[PDB]
Design a protein around this ligand. Structure first.
Ligand SMILES: c1ccc(-c2c3c(nc([C@H]4CCCO4)c2-c2nnn[nH]2)CCCCC3)cc1
Length: 134
Protein backbone atom coordinates (compact mmCIF):
# COMPACT_ATOMS: atom_id res chain seq x y z
CA UNK A 1 0.00 0.00 0.00
CA UNK A 2 0.87 3.62 -0.62
CA UNK A 3 -0.74 6.88 0.26
CA UNK A 4 -1.45 7.25 -3.51
CA UNK A 5 -3.87 4.25 -3.30
CA UNK A 6 -6.81 6.46 -2.33
CA UNK A 7 -6.74 8.05 -5.78
CA UNK A 8 -6.83 4.82 -7.78
CA UNK A 9 -10.04 4.05 -9.63
CA UNK A 10 -12.50 5.44 -12.15
CA UNK A 11 -13.97 8.79 -11.25
CA UNK A 12 -16.86 10.51 -13.07
CA UNK A 13 -17.40 14.30 -13.17
CA UNK A 14 -20.38 15.29 -11.02
CA UNK A 15 -19.98 19.06 -10.62
CA UNK A 16 -18.00 21.90 -12.08
CA UNK A 17 -17.66 25.50 -10.99
CA UNK A 18 -15.96 28.37 -12.86
CA UNK A 19 -14.40 26.13 -15.51
CA UNK A 20 -15.35 28.43 -18.39
CA UNK A 21 -13.58 31.40 -16.75
CA UNK A 22 -10.58 29.23 -15.90
CA UNK A 23 -10.36 28.16 -19.54
CA UNK A 24 -10.58 31.80 -20.67
CA UNK A 25 -7.63 32.63 -18.41
CA UNK A 26 -5.67 29.70 -19.83
CA UNK A 27 -6.28 31.09 -23.31
CA UNK A 28 -8.69 28.51 -24.65
CA UNK A 29 -10.77 29.68 -27.58
CA UNK A 30 -14.52 29.94 -27.68
CA UNK A 31 -15.38 26.73 -29.57
CA UNK A 32 -13.08 24.55 -27.49
CA UNK A 33 -14.41 26.10 -24.30
CA UNK A 34 -17.95 25.33 -25.28
CA UNK A 35 -17.34 21.73 -26.31
CA UNK A 36 -14.85 20.95 -23.54
CA UNK A 37 -17.10 22.58 -20.95
CA UNK A 38 -19.92 20.33 -22.04
CA UNK A 39 -17.92 17.18 -21.47
CA UNK A 40 -18.46 14.91 -18.51
CA UNK A 41 -15.07 13.21 -18.27
CA UNK A 42 -14.09 10.13 -16.43
CA UNK A 43 -10.72 10.31 -14.70
CA UNK A 44 -9.05 6.87 -14.47
CA UNK A 45 -6.09 6.71 -12.10
CA UNK A 46 -3.81 3.71 -11.71
CA UNK A 47 -0.41 2.96 -10.26
CA UNK A 48 2.19 0.38 -11.38
CA UNK A 49 5.33 0.53 -9.32
CA UNK A 50 6.53 4.14 -9.32
CA UNK A 51 4.53 5.02 -12.45
CA UNK A 52 1.19 6.77 -12.03
CA UNK A 53 -1.19 6.88 -15.00
CA UNK A 54 -4.05 9.35 -15.24
CA UNK A 55 -6.47 9.02 -18.16
CA UNK A 56 -9.26 11.41 -18.95
CA UNK A 57 -11.97 9.98 -21.20
CA UNK A 58 -14.80 11.94 -22.66
CA UNK A 59 -16.76 12.64 -25.80
CA UNK A 60 -14.44 15.59 -26.50
CA UNK A 61 -10.99 14.10 -26.16
CA UNK A 62 -9.27 11.21 -24.47
CA UNK A 63 -5.95 12.03 -22.79
CA UNK A 64 -3.44 9.92 -20.92
CA UNK A 65 -0.39 10.85 -18.89
CA UNK A 66 2.05 8.54 -17.17
CA UNK A 67 4.68 9.93 -14.84
CA UNK A 68 6.93 9.48 -11.83
CA UNK A 69 6.40 11.87 -8.97
CA UNK A 70 8.84 14.78 -9.14
CA UNK A 71 10.07 13.98 -12.67
CA UNK A 72 9.15 16.50 -15.36
CA UNK A 73 7.49 15.33 -18.55
CA UNK A 74 6.17 16.87 -21.76
CA UNK A 75 2.32 16.77 -21.99
CA UNK A 76 -0.06 17.76 -24.80
CA UNK A 77 -3.31 18.88 -23.10
CA UNK A 78 -6.82 18.21 -24.38
CA UNK A 79 -6.96 21.75 -25.73
CA UNK A 80 -3.68 21.17 -27.60
CA UNK A 81 -1.23 23.09 -25.49
CA UNK A 82 2.32 21.70 -25.46
CA UNK A 83 3.32 21.99 -21.79
CA UNK A 84 6.07 20.87 -19.46
CA UNK A 85 4.56 19.23 -16.43
CA UNK A 86 5.68 18.10 -13.01
CA UNK A 87 3.46 16.24 -10.55
CA UNK A 88 4.33 15.79 -6.89
CA UNK A 89 2.53 14.54 -3.81
CA UNK A 90 2.40 17.28 -1.13
CA UNK A 91 0.71 16.52 2.03
CA UNK A 92 -1.56 13.93 0.42
CA UNK A 93 -2.49 16.18 -2.54
CA UNK A 94 -1.36 15.48 -6.09
CA UNK A 95 -0.01 18.83 -7.32
CA UNK A 96 0.33 19.12 -11.14
CA UNK A 97 2.07 22.20 -12.52
CA UNK A 98 2.02 22.90 -16.28
CA UNK A 99 4.35 25.44 -17.84
CA UNK A 100 4.13 26.84 -21.38
CA UNK A 101 4.86 30.17 -23.10
CA UNK A 102 5.94 31.82 -19.88
CA UNK A 103 2.61 30.86 -18.26
CA UNK A 104 1.76 28.38 -15.49
CA UNK A 105 -1.30 26.65 -14.20
CA UNK A 106 -1.69 24.30 -11.22
CA UNK A 107 -4.12 21.40 -10.94
CA UNK A 108 -4.53 19.92 -7.43
CA UNK A 109 -6.30 16.55 -6.96
CA UNK A 110 -7.40 15.72 -3.42
CA UNK A 111 -9.45 12.94 -1.84
CA UNK A 112 -12.23 14.44 0.30
CA UNK A 113 -14.87 12.07 1.68
CA UNK A 114 -15.88 9.82 -1.23
CA UNK A 115 -14.94 12.42 -3.82
CA UNK A 116 -11.99 13.48 -5.82
CA UNK A 117 -11.90 17.29 -5.60
CA UNK A 118 -9.86 18.98 -8.33
CA UNK A 119 -8.89 22.59 -8.12
CA UNK A 120 -7.38 24.34 -11.13
CA UNK A 121 -5.80 27.74 -10.79
CA UNK A 122 -4.51 30.20 -13.44
CA UNK A 123 -3.65 33.87 -12.60
CA UNK A 124 -6.18 34.21 -9.79
CA UNK A 125 -8.97 32.25 -11.34
CA UNK A 126 -9.88 28.95 -9.73
CA UNK A 127 -12.17 26.24 -10.95
CA UNK A 128 -13.37 23.39 -8.77
CA UNK A 129 -14.44 20.10 -10.30
CA UNK A 130 -15.77 17.21 -8.24
CA UNK A 131 -15.61 13.57 -9.33
CA UNK A 132 -17.25 10.52 -7.74
CA UNK A 133 -16.53 6.78 -8.18
CA UNK A 134 -18.00 5.34 -11.26
C1 LIG B 1 -12.74 16.99 -21.68
C2 LIG B 1 -13.06 18.18 -21.10
C3 LIG B 1 -12.13 18.91 -20.39
C4 LIG B 1 -10.82 18.42 -20.24
C5 LIG B 1 -9.83 19.23 -19.47
C6 LIG B 1 -9.19 20.36 -20.01
C7 LIG B 1 -8.38 21.14 -19.19
N1 LIG B 1 -8.23 20.91 -17.89
C8 LIG B 1 -8.81 19.80 -17.35
C9 LIG B 1 -8.60 19.70 -15.87
C10 LIG B 1 -9.84 19.91 -15.01
C11 LIG B 1 -9.57 19.11 -13.80
C12 LIG B 1 -8.90 17.93 -14.38
O1 LIG B 1 -8.18 18.43 -15.53
C13 LIG B 1 -9.62 18.95 -18.11
C14 LIG B 1 -10.27 17.76 -17.55
N2 LIG B 1 -11.42 17.70 -16.87
N3 LIG B 1 -11.59 16.38 -16.55
N4 LIG B 1 -10.57 15.68 -17.04
N5 LIG B 1 -9.72 16.55 -17.63
C15 LIG B 1 -7.71 22.37 -19.73
C16 LIG B 1 -8.64 23.52 -20.14
C17 LIG B 1 -9.25 23.30 -21.45
C18 LIG B 1 -10.10 22.07 -21.65
C19 LIG B 1 -9.40 20.74 -21.45
C20 LIG B 1 -10.50 17.23 -20.84
C21 LIG B 1 -11.48 16.50 -21.57
Amino acid sequence: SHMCDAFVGTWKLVSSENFDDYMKEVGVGFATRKVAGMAKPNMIISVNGDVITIKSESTFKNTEISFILGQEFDEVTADDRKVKSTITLDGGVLVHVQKWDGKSTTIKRKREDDKLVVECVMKGVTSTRVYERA
